[PDB]
Structure formats: C-alpha cells, structure tokens
C-alpha cells in the first residue's frame, strides 16, 4: 500500500 | 530466436505449471504482495490464451512476429531458469535471506515486467507494437528517427543509436545502463522498456546526467527491489528516522516508489505525483523526511 507523499 | 507454433506455447504452459507447483510450497511462506508469482504466471497464461484466440486462422502471421518470438523464447528461458533455481538451491530456497531466495524474488519481478510488456504490445490480444505511443515527445522522436516503428531492437543497436545522441562514457557505464533499461533481462530493448526508462529519467535533454545522479552515484537507488524487500531493508533503520531508499514501482511501471522511516516508527512507501523525482528528493531533504539514503549519514546534493 502506497501512501501520500510527505 | 525460433518460430512459434501452438505446440511451443503449450510447452511453456507446462513449464509455467511446473513453476507454480514449486512456488505453492508452504515452506516458502510467499506473501501476496506484488510481484506475486502465483498470480503472474496464471495471468501470463491467460493473456497468451487471449493472443492465440485473436490469431485463429492467422497463426503464420503471429509466429513470424519478431517481438513475440523473442518474448516466448525469454519466457521459456526464464521459466527454465526458475526450475533450475529450485533444483540447485534445495533447502536454501526456504531461508529468508539466502541468495537463491533473492534470485527467485528478482525473477518474480522479471515475470511481472514481462507481463506488463506483453500487455502493452498486445493490448486486447492483437499486436500494436508498430503504433506504440512513447510518452515523452523528445524520446518519441528519438525512437522514430532511429528505429521507425520497430517494437524491439538488439541491445547493441539501441546502444549505438543512443550513443550518437547521448554519449555513453564507458563500457562499464554502458553495461549499467543496460542492467537498468533491460527490464525483461533478454538483451533486447523493447519500445515499451524504452518508454519506461525515459519516463523515469526525464527530461530527455539531460537523460544520462539524470540517470547518473539518481541511480549510478546515488546510494538511495535500489535496482530490482520489491515493496516487501524495501520494507525489510529499512527495518534495520527503524530507529533512524529520515532513512530512505527508492526504486521502480512494480505495479505502476514508469513511476518511482520512495520508502522512508518516519519519526513515529512507521515505514511508509509513496509514489511522487506532479513532481519529478529530483524535486521530491530535494524537498524531502529540506522538509526532513529524506535525509539518510540507505541509512547513510551523507546525502547526495542534487542542485
Ligand atoms: Na528487454
């Protein structure tokens, strides 16, 4: 699972 | 590269079958994450079924097609090399960090790259390689002028053509460029692999400078690494927030995946959008998230 960039 | 008759495809299926059975071994504890060889090989079979069904009454056409002949040879080779790996590795195939197990993971990735390529050249089961749309306009005119509408070229031909526009400084750099772009590990460059490479390392105008800074001299970069391998690799840095590595996304070919350790003990992975990788790394440095490439205290400067 890929999450939104910081 | 030989002619492909239905009898050959049925021979790859039998071997692909053999791999599936080997990879259903409870000792492997294979996770479901992409790339998942127990999905990839059934799906390759199914897409091969589809291509075959669109060329009823036209097999002579399909078997003369150059890309497809190369694809099927490489699929025979890779499948056979996977069966040999299990034979020669024996109980080391079940040891989490063993070299033979790592080789199986890299093959898993190669099988994933082969399927994406096969679907990009044969969407809906018919060949469309001669109309493939390269994504960067820059890169698009390079391929047309050098190769016209060819779908696949030998590495040497690709190399010499690229050299005339983007000079490769050495034999060793040329072989590292090869290892990067040649996603299917078959000593040919497909127009699809070329599209992937030029999306990752754009802009075309500084192609090889970009690839040098981001992959050749960057300790953050990780060739042929999967999502899980990235998580496991950052685990040793769980107590060092700002540690990070980056690689090609398996499921979104052409885009980058950055793994990093947060201050609250999470290991997260993100795919940058509307922002080149250069800029995401620079901003990530400034903002404190991307500080320690592969855990190292020193970070490349990319200004
Ligand atoms: Na290739």
XYZ file of C-alpha atoms and ligand atoms in Angstrom:
310
model
C 0.000 0.000 0.000
C 1.272 3.365 -1.211
C 0.536 6.455 0.840
C 0.518 10.158 0.049
C 3.821 11.966 -0.120
C 5.122 13.954 2.880
C 15.005 -16.722 -31.897
C 12.770 -19.508 -33.246
C 9.336 -19.683 -34.894
C 6.386 -20.042 -32.503
C 3.751 -22.702 -33.183
C 0.835 -23.524 -30.874
C 2.791 -26.604 -29.802
C 5.532 -24.393 -28.357
C 3.111 -22.271 -26.326
C 1.621 -25.429 -24.841
C 5.212 -26.340 -23.879
C 5.746 -23.070 -21.966
C 2.409 -23.581 -20.201
C 3.570 -26.983 -18.938
C 6.730 -25.408 -17.531
C 4.857 -22.402 -16.096
C 2.664 -25.020 -14.422
C 5.832 -26.628 -13.044
C 6.937 -23.314 -11.500
C 3.523 -22.681 -9.911
C 3.651 -26.079 -8.227
C 7.161 -25.347 -6.899
C 6.029 -21.933 -5.608
C 2.959 -23.381 -3.842
C 5.406 -24.913 -1.242
C 4.318 -23.986 2.334
C 7.988 -23.626 3.312
C 8.349 -20.528 1.091
C 5.736 -18.508 3.009
C 5.234 -16.407 -0.142
C 3.284 -13.220 0.579
C 0.560 -11.943 -1.783
C 2.218 -8.570 -2.428
C 3.196 -7.519 -5.968
C 5.076 -9.163 -7.556
C 3.199 -12.364 -6.794
C 4.382 -15.237 -8.937
C 1.277 -17.343 -8.226
C -0.848 -14.629 -9.913
C 1.650 -13.515 -12.574
C 2.063 -16.885 -14.259
C -1.670 -17.747 -14.449
C -2.255 -14.231 -15.821
C 0.524 -14.640 -18.408
C -1.087 -17.906 -19.487
C -4.452 -16.165 -19.799
C -3.037 -13.308 -21.844
C -1.284 -15.856 -24.072
C -4.677 -17.574 -24.437
C -6.126 -14.248 -25.487
C -3.430 -13.532 -28.104
C -3.815 -17.029 -29.541
C -7.585 -16.614 -29.808
C -7.254 -13.374 -31.826
C -4.993 -15.171 -34.369
C -7.124 -18.182 -35.243
C -6.728 -18.541 -39.000
C -3.594 -16.368 -38.838
C -1.024 -18.312 -36.811
C 1.591 -18.000 -39.576
C 1.309 -14.231 -39.073
C 1.654 -14.490 -35.288
C 4.613 -16.900 -35.373
C 6.613 -14.676 -37.756
C 6.163 -11.649 -35.476
C 9.612 -10.787 -34.123
C 8.700 -9.340 -30.702
C 6.514 -12.361 -29.944
C 9.226 -14.840 -30.939
C 11.674 -13.084 -28.609
C 9.085 -12.854 -25.790
C 8.280 -16.581 -25.921
C 11.961 -17.547 -26.037
C 12.659 -15.420 -22.989
C 9.609 -16.943 -21.305
C 10.925 -20.463 -21.955
C 14.363 -19.373 -20.682
C 13.109 -17.637 -17.525
C 10.744 -20.462 -16.632
C 13.562 -22.999 -17.073
C 15.935 -20.848 -15.052
C 13.325 -20.745 -12.237
C 13.007 -24.544 -12.198
C 16.820 -24.866 -12.093
C 16.999 -22.383 -9.219
C 14.729 -24.617 -7.132
C 16.767 -27.700 -8.075
C 20.207 -26.215 -7.263
C 19.111 -24.300 -4.126
C 17.141 -27.020 -2.397
C 16.566 -26.122 1.265
C 18.245 -22.697 0.850
C 15.112 -21.687 -1.108
C 13.322 -21.504 2.259
C 15.955 -19.404 4.090
C 14.615 -15.887 4.097
C 17.848 -14.023 3.231
C 19.578 -16.685 1.115
C 20.957 -15.798 -2.279
C 18.807 -18.413 -4.074
C 15.678 -16.939 -2.481
C 16.743 -13.444 -3.593
C 17.176 -14.800 -7.134
C 13.563 -16.062 -7.004
C 12.335 -12.634 -5.984
C 14.196 -10.964 -8.836
C 12.702 -13.476 -11.265
C 9.277 -12.739 -9.790
C 9.882 -9.125 -10.673
C 11.093 -10.077 -14.169
C 7.928 -12.111 -14.741
C 5.963 -9.016 -13.694
C 7.901 -6.856 -16.152
C 7.338 -9.370 -18.916
C 3.559 -9.372 -18.409
C 3.288 -5.599 -18.394
C 5.364 -5.517 -21.601
C 3.276 -8.252 -23.224
C 0.059 -6.381 -22.349
C 1.482 -3.094 -23.643
C 2.448 -4.579 -27.027
C -0.616 -6.884 -27.378
C -3.498 -4.996 -25.688
C -6.707 -6.936 -26.376
C -4.659 -9.775 -27.928
C -3.624 -8.084 -31.191
C -0.165 -6.741 -31.985
C 0.066 -2.941 -31.789
C 3.812 -2.571 -31.301
C 4.207 -0.645 -34.553
C 1.783 2.003 -33.244
C 3.016 2.088 -29.624
C 2.828 5.644 -28.278
C 6.003 6.690 -26.483
C 5.160 9.039 -23.658
C 7.822 11.764 -23.783
C 7.722 13.626 -27.116
C 11.524 14.112 -27.032
C 12.065 10.408 -26.513
C 9.394 9.634 -29.095
C 11.193 11.354 -31.990
C 14.477 9.695 -30.969
C 12.965 6.230 -31.444
C 11.139 7.025 -34.690
C 14.209 8.509 -36.370
C 16.448 5.626 -35.248
C 14.099 2.617 -35.418
C 10.952 3.773 -37.239
C 8.087 1.634 -35.935
C 10.126 -1.352 -34.734
C 8.901 -2.864 -31.488
C 12.207 -4.435 -30.346
C 15.896 -3.920 -31.129
C 19.095 -5.710 -30.039
C 20.932 -4.083 -27.149
C 23.941 -3.257 -29.375
C 21.753 -1.412 -31.882
C 19.952 0.503 -29.141
C 23.272 1.329 -27.507
C 24.898 2.696 -30.674
C 21.854 4.764 -31.574
C 21.601 6.256 -28.099
C 25.364 6.960 -28.081
C 25.022 9.152 -31.194
C 22.612 11.475 -29.290
C 23.624 10.879 -25.638
C 27.274 9.789 -25.406
C 27.964 6.876 -23.082
C 31.285 7.466 -21.370
C 32.480 3.880 -20.979
C 31.864 0.191 -21.413
C 31.078 -0.209 -17.673
C 28.553 2.662 -17.734
C 27.013 1.087 -20.865
C 26.547 -2.208 -19.046
C 24.956 -0.397 -16.078
C 22.627 1.440 -18.433
C 21.744 -1.975 -19.894
C 21.014 -3.503 -16.470
C 18.584 -0.608 -15.775
C 16.594 -0.438 -19.048
C 16.551 -4.165 -19.851
C 13.627 -4.934 -17.536
C 12.894 -8.327 -19.090
C 16.591 -9.335 -18.931
C 16.716 -10.592 -22.516
C 19.455 -8.470 -24.216
C 16.804 -6.683 -26.316
C 15.296 -3.252 -25.742
C 11.568 -3.024 -26.465
C 9.871 0.272 -27.268
C 7.943 -0.382 -24.040
C 11.137 -0.706 -21.951
C 12.391 2.416 -23.708
C 9.201 4.261 -22.775
C 9.580 3.181 -19.123
C 13.235 4.231 -18.935
C 12.684 7.680 -20.456
C 9.679 8.340 -18.190
C 11.754 7.525 -15.071
C 14.819 9.547 -16.098
C 13.274 12.534 -17.898
C 13.894 15.159 -19.152
C 15.377 13.594 -22.239
C 17.643 16.592 -22.741
C 19.754 15.514 -19.694
C 18.817 11.826 -19.833
C 22.148 10.289 -18.853
C 23.096 13.019 -16.370
C 19.733 12.331 -14.616
C 20.252 8.589 -14.566
C 23.783 9.058 -13.274
C 22.750 11.282 -10.360
C 19.663 9.225 -9.433
C 20.910 5.690 -9.960
C 24.630 5.436 -10.763
C 26.078 7.570 -7.945
C 23.033 7.563 -5.516
C 23.182 5.091 -2.633
C 19.408 5.526 -2.242
C 18.623 3.788 -5.516
C 17.682 0.100 -5.392
C 17.577 -1.894 -8.630
C 15.096 -4.787 -8.937
C 13.682 -4.374 -5.407
C 10.099 -5.102 -4.420
C 7.808 -3.367 -1.970
C 8.416 -6.014 0.736
C 12.180 -6.055 0.227
C 12.153 -2.280 0.715
C 10.235 -2.588 3.979
C 12.580 -5.340 5.268
C 15.673 -3.312 4.258
C 14.550 -0.202 6.142
C 13.744 -2.242 9.255
C 17.357 -2.030 10.440
C 16.914 1.759 10.359
C 13.636 1.864 12.299
C 15.382 3.954 14.995
C 16.984 6.326 12.474
C 14.120 8.484 11.117
C 14.787 10.068 7.736
C 16.341 6.906 6.353
C 15.089 6.265 2.829
C 15.532 4.259 -0.362
C 13.829 4.445 -3.756
C 13.186 2.131 -6.686
C 10.927 1.451 -9.649
C 7.318 0.715 -8.812
C 6.364 -2.804 -9.825
C 2.617 -2.112 -10.298
C 2.930 1.376 -11.804
C 5.749 0.865 -14.289
C 7.286 4.180 -15.192
C 6.857 5.799 -11.792
C 9.050 5.938 -8.709
C 8.423 4.475 -5.223
C 10.188 6.054 -2.212
C 10.368 4.175 1.095
C 11.202 6.044 4.277
C 11.254 5.755 8.082
C 9.078 8.267 9.930
C 9.758 9.782 13.325
C 6.893 7.764 14.826
C 8.266 4.392 13.776
C 6.385 3.737 10.550
C 7.959 2.568 7.301
C 5.883 4.132 4.522
C 6.105 3.990 0.711
C 4.919 6.776 -1.609
C 4.778 7.351 -5.387
C 5.526 11.017 -6.250
C 2.977 12.822 -8.487
C 3.158 16.065 -10.461
C 6.778 16.443 -9.373
C 9.937 14.860 -10.775
C 11.901 12.563 -8.524
C 14.704 15.134 -8.309
C 12.364 17.665 -6.778
C 10.754 15.184 -4.365
C 14.177 14.175 -3.054
C 15.289 17.808 -2.698
C 12.103 18.827 -0.948
C 12.131 15.685 1.145
C 15.626 16.602 2.304
C 14.625 20.188 3.123
C 11.488 19.038 4.921
C 13.309 16.385 6.966
C 11.864 13.160 5.554
C 14.539 12.004 3.084
C 17.835 12.511 4.937
C 19.825 9.272 5.071
C 19.991 7.306 1.813
C 20.149 3.620 2.648
C 20.771 4.750 6.243
C 23.942 6.652 5.404
C 24.718 9.884 7.180
C 25.613 11.695 3.964
C 23.038 12.589 1.307
C 23.750 13.385 -2.373
C 23.294 17.022 -3.348
C 21.010 17.351 -6.383
C 21.047 21.121 -7.070
Na 14.472 -6.445 -22.558
